[PDB]
């Protein structure tokens, strides 16, 4: 074509060992979540949208999923509480459950309007973080202790469950994962001297998107509705000082990367 | 005249309105988009592609207005926030978009993607302007706003003058 992907693959990394499932909740609104499981190297691979549209993959399934389930609808009712308790007006919340099955441990953060208020480790106790900005009347102590979280025994009781069901998801991922079946696009805009990278993917990694020679660009992930994954990137060339040779680096916790760029 | 506009309004919520966000897009009368805390076709597609930097855009625009020392309005209380972004600008030589902020009508500026160069104003915006100028996530936001959707967009703006 017009542009050029090398793949280099060294080692397979299997990223399915030390398995640990990250379980978000945002609170936006009265009645609106979006909730989303994640593994340590992955994008999501579970999301609910506060829309209530559900996406995940074509070889999940979703009804299969009581207890994670469960867990969110949990959080619906603990976010709910502790908002109209505590705080009283219906600010943004969100809470992030980092969890081992086994052994079974989690770490619970609370984050509000970008920044981390409370860290509850089992072991420690709830260390307060941070301050939200507009809340003079609430006090340190209620936001420490709603920063235990709740819900965590659905996960402790189901963990041998989850363990199995979230290792069975790892695995078919790694074994999905084929850097030659994902498409990759270059786009320039002659008129603002942009350029964009983009790669379309059914493989939910966190893949890291940068160029070769270290200058930023802004890059961010899109999920679709059917299992469809894009990781995008744009660059300002001017941002290049004059030159006109870049590379896109795209890389998998897998252990493989691909580079995009145009040639002849 | 027809080109894509975009508002958006980030307020503290309060229990009587428990909402802090709300986006609005138009091409002209015609509603391409509609977004908020509370709830929530060429137009079709056009809406669904700026569905997520919208939402994005302003969960991340609550971010700096929480964060950020703004006194006036008597520091009444919570800056109130409306943002204008119309796309594409009429003095551009390439089409870009604007980004027009107005917190709490105090303060007044505006982001010219075509030039990376921002304007106020008047002395004390251009003090808030500046604090905003410098954070990297939020300027290539707003840059790459439109690019991330930039051929539905463009193309939908050329069926209207049809
Ligand atoms: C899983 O999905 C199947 C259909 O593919 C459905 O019949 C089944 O009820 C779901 N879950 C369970 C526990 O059966
Ligand atoms: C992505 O690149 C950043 C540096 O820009 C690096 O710190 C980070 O570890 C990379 N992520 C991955 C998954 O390689």
Redesign the pocket.
């Known amino acids: 074509s017009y542009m050029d992907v090398r793949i280099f693959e060294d080692e397979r990394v299997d990223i399915c060992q030390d398995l640990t499932a990250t379980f978000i909740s945002y609170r936006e609104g009265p009645e609106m979540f979006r909730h989303s499981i994640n593994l340590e190297q992955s994008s999501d691979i579970f999301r609910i949208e506060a829309s209530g549209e559900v996406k995940h993959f074509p070889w999940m399934n979703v009804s299969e999923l009581a207890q994670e389930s469960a867990f969110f609808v949990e959080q619906e009712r603990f976010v709910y509480e502790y908002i109209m308790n505590v705080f009283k007006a219906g600010r943004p919340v969100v809470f992030e459950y980092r969890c081992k099955f086994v052994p079974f441990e989690c770490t619970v953060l609370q984050m509000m309007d970008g920044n981390t208020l409370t860290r509850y480790t089992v072991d420690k106790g709830v260390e307060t973080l941070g301050s939200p900005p507009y809340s003079p009347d609430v006090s340190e102590d209620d936001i420490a202790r709603y920063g235990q979280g709740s819900g965590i025994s659905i996960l402790r009781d189901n963990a041998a469950l989850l363990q199995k069901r979230w290792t069975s998801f790892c695995r078919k991922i790694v074994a999905m994962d084929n850097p030659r079946h994902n498409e990759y696009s270059l786009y320039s805009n002659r008129g603002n001297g942009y350029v964009s990278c983009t790669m379309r993917t059914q493989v939910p990694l966190?893949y890291?998107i940068?160029l070769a020679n270290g200058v930023d660009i802004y890059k961010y992930m899109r999920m679709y509705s059917g299992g469809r994954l894009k990781v995008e990137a744009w660059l300002d060339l001017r941002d290049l000082n004059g030159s006109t040779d870049f590379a896109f680096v795209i890389?998998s916790?897998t252990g493989w990367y691909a580079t995009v760029k145009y040639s002849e | 005249a027809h080109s894509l506009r975009c508002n958006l309004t980030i307020k503290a919520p309060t229990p009587a309105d428990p909402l802090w966000y709300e986006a609005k897009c138009l091409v002209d009368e015609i509603l391409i988009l509609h977004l908020s805390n509370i709830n929530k076709a060429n137009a079709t597609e056009v809406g669904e592609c700026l569905t997520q930097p919208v939402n994005d855009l302003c969960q991340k625009l609550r971010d700096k207005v929480s964060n950020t020392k703004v006194d006036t309005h008597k520091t009444n209380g919570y800056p109130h926030l409306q943002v204008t972004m119309i796309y594409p600008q009429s003095q551009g030589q390439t089409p870009s978009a604007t980004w027009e902020f107005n917190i709490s009508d105090s303060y007044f500026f505006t982001f010219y993607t075509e030039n990376m160069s921002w304007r106020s104003a008047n002395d004390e915006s251009g003090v808030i302007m500046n604090k905003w100028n410098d954070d990297g996530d939020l300027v290539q936001r707003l840059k790459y706003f439109i690019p991330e959707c930039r051929q539905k967009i463009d193309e939908f703006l050329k069926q209207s003058k049809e």
Request: proline letters at 20%; hydrophobic letters at 20%.
């Open positions: 966190a890291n940068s890389s916790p």
